[PDB]
Amino acid sequence: PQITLWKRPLVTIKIGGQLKEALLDTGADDTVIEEMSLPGRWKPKMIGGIGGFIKVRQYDQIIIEIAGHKAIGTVLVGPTPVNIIGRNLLTQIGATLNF
């Protein structure tokens, strides 16, 4: 679809078989999802955002659906304030910015 930006670009995702809401976030390199139980192997990682750095669990090669579109890639799981779909998965679904 084409998504305008008057409201937050929130979409439904399916991850680990569960529905969640997430923000399509062109300003994020990575995808970061709130704490959850997720099938797959992980390793500790640190990432930074506007306010500093946090600890997350890095899961590679995770199958996820974003507004109905398939991606398989890295998902970081940790205490993010909002679920964010970053460029690593936006590129997989063919998203671009247009103006």
Ligand X SMILES: CC(C)[C@H](NC(=O)COc1ccccc1)C(=O)N[C@@H](Cc1ccccc1)[C@@H](O)[C@H](N)[C@H](O)Cc1ccccc1
Q: Which two tokens stand for residue 46?
A: 């640190």
DSSP 3-state of 42? strand
Residues that bind its own copies (CB under 8 A): 1-6, 8-9, 23-29, 32, 47-54, 67, 69, 80-82, 84, 87, 90-91, 93-99
**Among 11-19, 58-66, 81-89, 91-99, which window interacts with ligand X (CB under 6 A)?**
81-89
- Rounded to the nearest whole angstrom, what is the least distance from the CB of residue 68 to ligand X in the complex? 22
DSSP letters of 9-30? -EEEEEETTEEEEEEE-TT-SS
Q: Using CA atoms, how far apart are residues 47 and 19, in angstroms rounded to an integer?
A: 24
CA torsion, points 52, 57, 20, 71, in degrees to nearest 10? Answer: 110
- Rounded to the nearest whole angstrom, what is the least distance from the CB of residue 77 to its own copies in the complex? 13
Residues lying near ligand X in the complex (CB under 6 A) are found at 23, 25, 27-30, 32, 47-50, 80-82, 84
Residues recognised as catalytic: 25
